[PDB]
Amino acid sequence: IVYEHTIRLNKAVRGKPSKKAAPIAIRAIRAQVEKLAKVEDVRLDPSVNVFVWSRGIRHVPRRIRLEVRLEGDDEHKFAYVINKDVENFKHLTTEKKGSE
Amino acid sequence: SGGIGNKFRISCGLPVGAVINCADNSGAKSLNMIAVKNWKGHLNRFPKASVGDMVLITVGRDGKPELRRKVTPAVVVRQRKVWRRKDGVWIYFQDNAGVIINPKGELKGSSITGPVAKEAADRWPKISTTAECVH
Amino acid sequence: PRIEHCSFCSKPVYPGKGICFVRNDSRVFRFCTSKCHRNFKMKRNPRKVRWTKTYRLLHNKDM
Amino acid sequence: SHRKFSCCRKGNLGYLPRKRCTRGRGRCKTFPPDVQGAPIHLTAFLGYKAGCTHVMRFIDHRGSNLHNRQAIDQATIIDAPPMICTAIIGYAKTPKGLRAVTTVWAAHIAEPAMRRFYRNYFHAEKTAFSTYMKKAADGTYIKEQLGRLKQHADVIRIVAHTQPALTPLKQKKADIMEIQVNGGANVAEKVDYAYALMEKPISIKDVFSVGAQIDTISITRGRGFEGVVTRWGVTRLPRKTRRGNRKVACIGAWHPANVQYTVARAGQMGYFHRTDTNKQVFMIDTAENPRCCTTEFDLTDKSINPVGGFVNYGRVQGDFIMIKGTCPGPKRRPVVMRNALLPHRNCPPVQLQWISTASKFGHGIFETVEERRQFYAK
Amino acid sequence: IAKLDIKGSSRGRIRARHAAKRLGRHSGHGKRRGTREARMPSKTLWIQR
RNA sequence: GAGACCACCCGGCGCGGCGCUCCUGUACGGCGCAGAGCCCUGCGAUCGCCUGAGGGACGCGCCUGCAGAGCGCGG
RNA sequence: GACCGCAGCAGGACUCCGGGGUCAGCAGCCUCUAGCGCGGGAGCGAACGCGGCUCAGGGAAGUCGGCAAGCCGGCUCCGUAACCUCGGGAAAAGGAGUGGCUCUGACGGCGCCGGGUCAGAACUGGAACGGACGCGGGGAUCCCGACUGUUUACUAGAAAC
């Protein structure tokens, strides 16, 4: 099962100090994936870590398209997320593809 | 009495220690405020004057020698801070200004220079008649 | 209702809104909002700014 | 020494203690006087606050500064969900104040009303009223109990469930506000008015006549634990001050060696239950009317829902009531309105000539959305 | 095992400003923030002269 | 709508999108038979057109895509 | 980066070599090289501090006193008093410009090459230019000491020496 969702980092880093914007965003992208994936472990591809930190530590990209593929079973349930490249987000929402 | 009529409170902008401009042809170039008539002061409150509040002012060195070294009653015609009349219009005058008036309200000199606010006119009539424009 | 027009924006100003100001030359100018007023303090020509009706008239979008 | 120059103790002491209000929302506490022989009317209603307006009106006040002159005043719109009588409550005048006698509920309690009894509805027993519903609904137990209330209790009240779904509030649990039949000719007449209204919708238009003065009681907006400078209005101590300028310099004199009740100190600055009084109701109208906010001056249909929507509120589906003046409380807050206890003797007659419907959100130059599509055209 | 480059910094932008300065594009009275003697020594014109 | 932790008001929340409305002031780019002039046959700060545009949003109406109410703990 | 301060202490310890860019500069502010993430981390953004930022109108009326903030500043060009030990004051005071482009003139070597400095113009930027950074507020007197210098390390930097 792979879920592709748009994650508003800007609507997450708001409410936290600017000097620590980027760390809070990484953690936020780890909290949100767990709720959507209904998993207990989130592993972030190094490529997402590049993207979120690309702008800097004070301001981050407003949104990052994330491909959340659950790759965990046997009660390990690790969910892997890799940043997908899109030109822009118009009619974009969670778009689950595939099944067990 | 001399100031006659009822004025709805308008926001008050000029406290004491203010050199309001003087538009009269009396020749007082500038007036420095000393007090506003009928001010019951609360502790540590500078007394303040709105458009049309009789204030006692002292003419500065720039002004004519005779009026200097004396407290003269004046009525503020223009206040820079915006004031809301009951119409709900918010109006702000370009530069703070005053006209020297008698306890009766007779001005020291006939001419009033530039705009005069409508609240000054109701309280003090002589200004109203000589006003070039009542804005 | 009663609607005036701004001395800068030229957008109809509904009653109760806007700051009305009187200049040194004894003329009332009704500013639309803080924006109509702040752009007028430094007299950035209304024509140069594209949001004012006056530029739209000059650029002919209004015709 | 002594006080030297004389000032005042800042802050009314009657309102102390300044604490988070324990009552869930505004409570009546005192109801209007009975005045036996008056027109039989209900005293109070409950609403939810909405965004403010900027109405323009004409003042026919003899011997006044603005007599016969156009003026603008500020009013707060309140959505009025139509209420339903859910029960009749009796009170007997007794040596210890008011003691209650024989409260009777309706044959069927309303579904929102049932939700009030349980903390959660879905995950709950839902067993409340099970015996009562079977006990009543045959119209016999209801009649005899109502008869007891009429015989042994002088003061009669209508328990009213308000409907939260009609308004945008996510409350979803009916709140119950007591209303009091007042002016009934004799004790019997009041009970019969209530029984007709049992399980029946009442809208605010029935409760409050237009142009009357009413009292707004609400839990006020708060800002959290605050410093003395805002909580009590004490003057800021001089800039150069070790340990910080914002604080009362001396909390007591040596001989009254304790902190006095009146001494200013930090406290929760909000959520106090507060009542304003004698505020006129400028317009009472159904929001459904397409022209509910139109005027002869308007020359367009003009509807209550403002352009861009009421900020921090919903679409005011029905019965908007505007009170001139700002009622206590933030938007989306329960506000009980009651007929005023001590109305201002001299009231300017209410003649609204225009009501502003321009976008509350942002600076809006468009009274109706249509004029805005017209301004931008293509 | 690998050795990476010095990651030398861009000297492209600097190149353009220095060529335009040769034509005098950036020599406006506001841009210079140094005394006229420092920019061209007043002794130096004389030593050449 | 309440907040130091708490407590309180509420609850299948919310996450994304879609509209509206507002904020800002014509977006990138394309085109020009605009441009002081220098000049190879091109360079050019800007200028106009597209473009009351583009961008954004915490308010507001929805929401089609995920979802959302313990097979906890007490009772 | 291990010395000495009870110690792996925002403290005190002598030099050597010292790239680019804006700039007058071994300045400030960025950067190659070169090092490296320190008595830990997460929530939460209440009071109240501590380090800044801004404020309508007026402005010292505050106060023991403009304490503190704030104003000014770079560059070019005019304009620069009283007094005076004529050396100064003096950056007195007081104004004008400053941006980016399109260009034209002055200077070492045509047979090709030097070097960016200065002027002088156009044309254009919401009516903006030292756009960050570095970076005097000014005048009127009076009282002491002439001043450059030295001082009671851990409460007095002066009129004292």
Automatic annotation (TrEMBL), chain A:
Query: What is one GO biological process annotated to this record?
Result: cytoplasmic translation
Q: Which UniProt keywords apply?
A: Ribonucleoprotein, Ribosomal protein
PROSITE patterns this protein is in? RIBOSOMAL_L31E
GO molecular-function terms, A-Z = structural constituent of ribosome
Instruction: Name a GO CC annotation attached to this entry.
Output: cytosolic large ribosomal subunit
Report if keyword Lyase is assigned. Answer: no
Keyword Amino-acid biosynthesis listed: no
Classification via InterPro entries:
Ribosomal_eL31, Ribosomal_eL31_CS, Ribosomal_eL31_dom_sf
A UniProt-annotated Pfam family: Ribosomal_L31e
Report the Gene3D superfamilies cross-referenced here. 3.10.440.10
Q: Which family does it belong to?
A: Belongs to the eukaryotic ribosomal protein eL31 family.
**Name listed for the protein in its UniProt record:** Ribosomal protein L31e
What does the organism's lineage look like at the top?
A: Eukaryota, Metamonada, Diplomonadida, Hexamitidae, Giardiinae
TrEMBL record, chain B:
SMART domains attached here? Ribosomal_L14 (SM01374)
Q: Which organism is it from?
A: Giardia intestinalis (strain ATCC 50803 / WB clone C6)
Q: Where does Mg(2+) bind?
A: 44
What the entry lists under InterPro entries is as follows: Ribosomal_uL14, Ribosomal_uL14_CS, Ribosomal_uL14_sf
UniProt name for this protein: Ribosomal protein L23
User: Which UniProt keywords are given for this protein, alphabetically ordered?
Assistant: Metal-binding, Ribonucleoprotein, Ribosomal protein
Tell me one GO molecular function of this protein: structural constituent of ribosome
Q: Record's Gene Ontology CC terms? A: cytosolic large ribosomal subunit
GO biological process annotations for this chain's record? Answer: translation
The answer, when asked if Metal-binding is one of the entry's keywords, is: yes
Automatic annotation (TrEMBL), chain C:
Subcellular locations according to the entry: Nucleus
- Residue intervals passing through the bilayer: none
Domain of life according to the entry: Eukaryota
Residue pairs linked by disulfide bridges in the UniProt entry: 6-9, 6-32, 6-36, 9-32, 9-36, 32-36
Tell me its family.
Answer: Belongs to the eukaryotic ribosomal protein eL24 family.
- The identity of this protein, by name, is Ribosomal protein L24e
**What's the source species for this entry?**
Giardia intestinalis (strain ATCC 50803 / WB clone C6) (Giardia lamblia)
Measured against the full-length protein, the chain present covers 2 to 64 of 189
UniProtKB/TrEMBL annotation, chain E:
Gene Ontology biological process terms from the UniProt entry = translation
One GO cellular component from the entry?
cytosolic large ribosomal subunit
Key words of the record: Ribonucleoprotein, Ribosomal protein
Q: Does the keyword Chloroplast apply?
A: no
Which parts of the sequence are annotated with region: Disordered? Answer: 13-39
Q: Which residues form a coiled coil?
A: none
Gene Ontology molecular function: RNA binding; structural constituent of ribosome
Segments of skewed composition (Basic residues):
13-34
| Family stated for the protein in its record | Belongs to the eukaryotic ribosomal protein eL19 family.
Q: Would you tell me the protein name for this molecule? A: Ribosomal protein L19
What species is this protein from?
A: Giardia intestinalis (strain ATCC 50803 / WB clone C6)
